[PDB]
């Protein structure tokens, strides 16, 4: 079975070569269908600081059956109890028509010490 | 009628499914002409502090007629008198082919402190 | 929580007219899709037409031509104008949202009250 959000997805960008997607609550993940094949750009504006002060680097995680082409990790160091901006953004292909996929923060180097208003946007750019 | 300033514009991307606006000048708001019927995707590149240090948390504004699909808000804390990138990016549909639109920089939460190198660039998706 | 309403469904006869509204609260209504979805009984819960945020719609090939979705963003409203009503147009119609607020239910739910409890729609020959 498929979800409305899944339903309404296939539909709403049948005609289109660029479609958004974003999750309005929380923003640290995305979840959707992709409408037709293409390639994403992920990108997760992110605040945090690091445990204890000091370094924390973060990327995106890479669902099965998708190859994460590049990826520019966001980073931060010191300012503890202070959430300062540390975007991470992805390229990924392989991604099909009607596939679910799901995108997470992932830690890359260090340990996290508290995020704020993070923000996963999601472009997919149709094949052909 | 059309002016010859909105022809320009509707002639210079005329074959292009993506066209690029930016203010030349303080760079804090782009005022622009859509040259075909498409959906916005606006970042606003900032770097400030917040009112005596803290938080300070920022966004893009929604002018008349426009949906702001998705947003992501911009954010720092702390670092009294010295500017940290803090960019928000926005993502509008309902852009029409010749129409005027006006996008700033708003405050989501707390009081600014000061700002630093603002660059606004609009990117335009036409619609098929 | 999430509230969708519908109302406007009856009883009619073929190449009559009836008005399907839906008011939503709960999400932030101006950025979500908004649609109405069907279940005549022995069939399956099947979308009929959508409306999406930035004003484009889709229509099943069965109603294109006879309905038209729209929407009033300031009372958070989908209607569904549906004209030159058949008797294959008899269903239970709900109304549904792709807010990314919300998790997204499994179409089949749509159809069993998973928002509102649907409004009777019934076409005579």
């Known amino acids: 079975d498929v979800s409305v959000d899944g339903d309404f997805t296939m539909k709403k960008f049948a005609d289109s070569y660029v479609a958004f997607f974003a999750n309005k609550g929380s923003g640290n993940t995305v979840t959707f269908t992709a409408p037709w094949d293409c390639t994403a750009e992920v990108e997760l504006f992110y605040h945090g600081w690091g445990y204890s002060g000091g370094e924390w680097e973060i990327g995106i995680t890479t669902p099965s059956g998708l190859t994460q082409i590049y990826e520019a990790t966001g980073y931060t160091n010191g300012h503890d109890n202070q959430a300062i901006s540390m975007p991470t953004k992805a390229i990924y292909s392989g991604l099909k028509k009607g596939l679910q996929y799901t995108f997470d923060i992932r830690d890359a180097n260090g340990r996290g010490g508290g995020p704020k208003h993070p923000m996963m946007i999601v472009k997919l750019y149709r094949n052909a | 009628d059309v002016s010859v300033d909105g022809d320009f514009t509707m002639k210079k991307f005329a074959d292009s499914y993506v066209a690029f606006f930016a203010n030349k000048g303080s760079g804090n708001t782009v005022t622009f002409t859509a040259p075909w019927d498409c959906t916005a995707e606006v970042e606003l590149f900032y770097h400030g502090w917040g009112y005596s240090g803290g938080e300070w948390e920022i966004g893009i504004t929604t002018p008349s007629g426009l949906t702001q699909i998705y947003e992501a808000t911009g954010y720092t804390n702390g670092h009294d008198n010295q500017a940290i990138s803090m960019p928000t990016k926005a993502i509008y549909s309902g852009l029409k082919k010749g129409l005027q639109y006006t996008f700033d920089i708003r405050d989501a939460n707390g009081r600014g402190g000061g700002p630093k190198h603002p660059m606004m660039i609009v990117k335009l998706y036409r619609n098929a | 929580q999430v509230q969708l309403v519908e109302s406007g469904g009856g009883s009619v006869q073929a190449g009559g007219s009836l008005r399907l509204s839906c008011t939503a609260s709960?999400?932030?209504?101006?950025?979500?899709?908004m649609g109405w979805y069907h279940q005549a009984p022995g069939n399956e819960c099947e979308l009929v037409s959508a409306?999406?945020?930035?004003?484009?719609?889709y229509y099943a090939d069965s109603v294109k031509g006879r309905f038209t979705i729209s929407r009033d963003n300031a009372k958070n409203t989908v209607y569904l104008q549906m004209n030159s009503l058949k008797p294959e147009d008899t269903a239970m119609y709900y109304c549904?949202?792709?807010?990314?607020?919300?998790?997204?239910?499994?179409?089949?739910?749509?159809?069993?009250?998973?928002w509102g409890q649907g409004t009777q729609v019934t076409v005579s020959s």
């Open positions: 409306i999406f945020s930035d004003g484009s719609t």
């Open positions: 709960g999400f932030t209504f101006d950025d979500s899709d």
């Open positions: 549904a949202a792709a807010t990314t607020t919300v998790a997204s239910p499994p179409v089949r739910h749509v159809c069993n009250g998973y």
